[PDB]
Amino acid sequence: NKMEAKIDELINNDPVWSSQNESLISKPYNHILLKPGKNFRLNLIVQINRVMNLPKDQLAIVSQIVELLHNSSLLIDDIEDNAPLRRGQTTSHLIFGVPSTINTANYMYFRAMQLVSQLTTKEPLYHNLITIFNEELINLHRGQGLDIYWRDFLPEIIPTQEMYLNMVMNKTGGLFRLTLRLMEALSPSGHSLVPFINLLGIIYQIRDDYLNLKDFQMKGFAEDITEGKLSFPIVHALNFTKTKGQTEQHNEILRILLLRTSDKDIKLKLIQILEFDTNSLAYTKNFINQLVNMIKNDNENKYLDELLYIIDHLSE
Amino acid sequence: NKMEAKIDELINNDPVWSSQNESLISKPYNHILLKPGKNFRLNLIVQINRVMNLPKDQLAIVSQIVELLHNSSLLIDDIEDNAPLRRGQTTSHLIFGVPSTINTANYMYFRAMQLVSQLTTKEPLYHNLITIFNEELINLHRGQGLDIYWRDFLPEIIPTQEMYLNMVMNKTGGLFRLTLRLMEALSPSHSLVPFINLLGIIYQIRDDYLNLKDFQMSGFAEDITEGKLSFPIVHALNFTKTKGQTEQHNEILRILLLRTSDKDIKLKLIQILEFDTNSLAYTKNFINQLVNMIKNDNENKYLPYIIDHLS
Ligand SMILES: O=P(O)(O)C(O)(Cc1cccc(-c2cccc(NS(=O)(=O)c3ccc4ccccc4c3)c2)c1)P(=O)(O)O
Numbered sequence: 001n002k003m004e005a006k007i008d009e010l011i012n013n014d015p016v017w018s019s020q021n022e023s024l025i026s027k028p029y030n031h032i033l034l035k036p037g038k039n040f041r042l043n044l045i046v047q048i049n050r051v052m053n054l055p056k057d058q059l060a061i062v063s064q065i066v067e068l069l070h071n072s073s074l075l076i077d078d079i080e081d082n083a084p085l086r087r088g089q090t091t092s093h094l095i096f097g098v099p100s101t102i103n104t105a106n107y108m109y110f111r112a113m114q115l116v117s118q119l120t121t122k123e124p125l126y127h128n129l130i131t132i133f134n135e136e137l138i139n140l141h142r143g144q145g146l147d148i149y150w151r152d153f154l155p156e157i158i159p160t161q162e163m164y165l166n167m168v169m170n171k172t173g174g175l176f177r178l179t180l181r182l183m184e185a186l187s188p189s190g191h192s193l194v195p196f197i198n199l200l201g202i203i204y205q206i207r208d209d210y211l212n213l214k215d216f217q218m219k220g221f222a223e224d225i226t227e228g229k230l231s232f233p234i235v236h237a238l239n240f241t242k243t244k245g246q247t248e249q250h251n252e253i254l255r256i257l258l259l260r261t262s263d264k265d266i267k268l269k270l271i272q273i274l275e276f277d278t279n280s281l282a283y284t285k286n287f288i289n290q291l292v293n294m295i296k297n298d299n300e301n302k303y304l305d306e307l308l309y310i311i312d313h314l315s316e
Numbered sequence: 317n318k319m320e321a322k323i324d325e326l327i328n329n330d331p332v333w334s335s336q337n338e339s340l341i342s343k344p345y346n347h348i349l350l351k352p353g354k355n356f357r358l359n360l361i362v363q364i365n366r367v368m369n370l371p372k373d374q375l376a377i378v379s380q381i382v383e384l385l386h387n388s389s390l391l392i393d394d395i396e397d398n399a400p401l402r403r404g405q406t407t408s409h410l411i412f413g414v415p416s417t418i419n420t421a422n423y424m425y426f427r428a429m430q431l432v433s434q435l436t437t438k439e440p441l442y443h444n445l446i447t448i449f450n451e452e453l454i455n456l457h458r459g460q461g462l463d464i465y466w467r468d469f470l471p472e473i474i475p476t477q478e479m480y481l482n483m484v485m486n487k488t489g490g491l492f493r494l495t496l497r498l499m500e501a502l503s504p505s506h507s508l509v510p511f512i513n514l515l516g517i518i519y520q521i522r523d524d525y526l527n528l529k530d531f532q533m534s535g536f537a538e539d540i541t542e543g544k545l546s547f548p549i550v551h552a553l554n555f556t557k558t559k560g561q562t563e564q565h566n567e568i569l570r571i572l573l574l575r576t577s578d579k580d581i582k583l584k585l586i587q588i589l590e591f592d593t594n595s596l597a598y599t600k601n602f603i604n605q606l607v608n609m610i611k612n613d614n615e616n617k618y619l620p621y622i623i624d625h626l627s
Pocket residue numbers: 357358360361382386389390393397460487488489490491492493495496523
């Protein structure tokens with residue numbers, strides 16, 4: 001009876017959750033917050049707003065939603081990629097464990113979703129905001145899924161440049177489009193900037209792939225090699241070697257990716273194969289320059305001051 | 317120019333996603349489907365619909381949402397618990413790897429979310445459905461987080477029975493309340509939430525209980541290998557602390573921290589629970605009392621075979 005009295009009180013009430021329970025499970029997340037880059041993601045949202053003109057308090061909420069998705073996605077990504085470092089610091093899952101980091105990151109996806117309701121009281125608009133949120137998160141996971149499948153089951157599938165670009169459109173375009181589409185839907189204020197934001201996302205991803213090797217060849221650890229990632233330079237090298245009949249090189253690239261090695265000489269041998277044998281580094285540098293010129297040479301404002309600053313710091 | 321033309325076509329279109337890409341990404345999920353249990357899940361939904369009377373088409377989508385949430389949460393739970401088996405088969409992360417399984421599980425969470433939108437087009441009711449989905453997923457994660465925290469930080473915090481029960485209301489109550497609450501809002505007809513919470517508690521304590529009991533009557537008692545603060549373990553820890561039985565308290569802690577697969581050591585912890593603290597009998601009794609709260613509910617305060625095959 002005292003037992004049943006306690007049970008009856010428990011089941012007729014909401015679940016008890018304290019501020020202390022809250023702090024305990026936020027550990028994986030608080031750790032990644034110490035990392036910088038939040039001012040650059042905020043700087044993009046700000047330039048875009050000069051076109052969208054959302055009031056500042058609404059923009060603030062869009063910002064928070066996007067920071068949560070972004071940080072949660074990096075927590076998961078580092079587990080998925082087995083990364084030891086992120087922004088010069090030890091990775092959350094190595095500190096608090098994969099179990100807590102996975103649960104916390106997923107918890108934060110749902111807190112971000114909860115924030116959408118603070119953007120309007122209008123039921124029609126709300127529905128659209130949630131649909132955008134849902135769609136681009138579906139897109140993000142589809143892209144990530146392919147990137148991870150290709151890498152983990154290599155050489156089952158050797159992606160082409162086309163396939164790589166479609167995966168980026170889902171993966172990276174997912175979060176870029178999500179921010180921009182929420183803003184365009186909230187705008188109280190010409191043509192959509194989705195194509196432009198897609199382009200920015202592609203430049204962002206390929207430049208990330210490139211610098212990861214270029215910083216190490218010349219700063220960084222070419223950690224993408226250790227991870228075995230089918231990066232833009234690797235995709236070009238794998239397809240170049242196949243096409244030119246460089247069987248031994250094609251096979252050595254695969255073998256090195258499959259070692260998941262941290263040996264600096266082995267990583268440097270692969271990067272020099274990309275520099276002199278396949279010319280994938282030059283191919284990638286020029287491909288990046290051509291994408292950037294599609295904008296810098298966009299006089300007819302077909303895609304489009306502060307535009308450029310953003311494109312040269314797109315690394316942060 | 318040919319490169320520019322192709323980039324322009326790419327950026328002006330929706331992201332390319334094919335049926336084959338969908339298949340690749342679904343593999344870790346199709347794997348756990350080969351797991352029976354959908355019928356007992358479906359039967360609970362069917363039986364409850366006799367109070368709610370949702371039209372079949374709507375009931376089917378609620379059922380699909382439930383199946384996705386439950387399957388995805390077990391794909392992730394097995395990674396979190398380093399479980400090698402689920403319903404006798406090899407867990408997905410051991411076959412497809414942890415990276416792919418986490419991502420697929422998460423992708424299905426959002427697929428489930430999308431289906432919510434097909435429950436109704438009425439704008440107010442849609443906000444309500446989404447809020448129910450959002451609230452119960454937050455609860456599930458909160459409870460899972462606390463359960464993992466206690467396990468991974470042991471011995472920093474040893475929960476009490478009360479704290480254990482609040483963790484369960486969040487963790488196990490979440491998917492139970494989520495289903496019930498969705499159906500109650502879609503009903504074209506008292507709340508059955510208290511009863512579904514009670515069902516959830518019985519379900520989690522019985523899960524914890526059978527994991528040790530099935531092993532002792534022959535079950536691998538994986539909860540011990542996992543080192544989790546299950547209901548009988550919580551009882552045993554507080555019992556020994558309270559009776560000032562220091563060495564038994566520490567012995568229980570030492571075994572859980574071993575994360576051991578050794579049958580003989582697992583048995584040793586079960587015999588501490590049987591002979592020293594009498595925790596297994598305390599749990600059998602606790603479950604029976606919760607079940608009686610239902611069998612002796614004559615005024616129908618909670619109610620408007622499932623309770624016996626709830627495991
Ligand atoms: O907590 P654990 O790790 O001990 C474990 O229970 C796994 C687990 C982790 C997290 C949540 C859950 C869980 C919560 C809620 C429901 C369920 N499963 S369920 O699919 O049978 C289910 C619950 C409520 C339902 C309500 C109405 C219709 C169908 C329902 C189905 C599982 C289980 P286990 O299988 O690993 O022992």
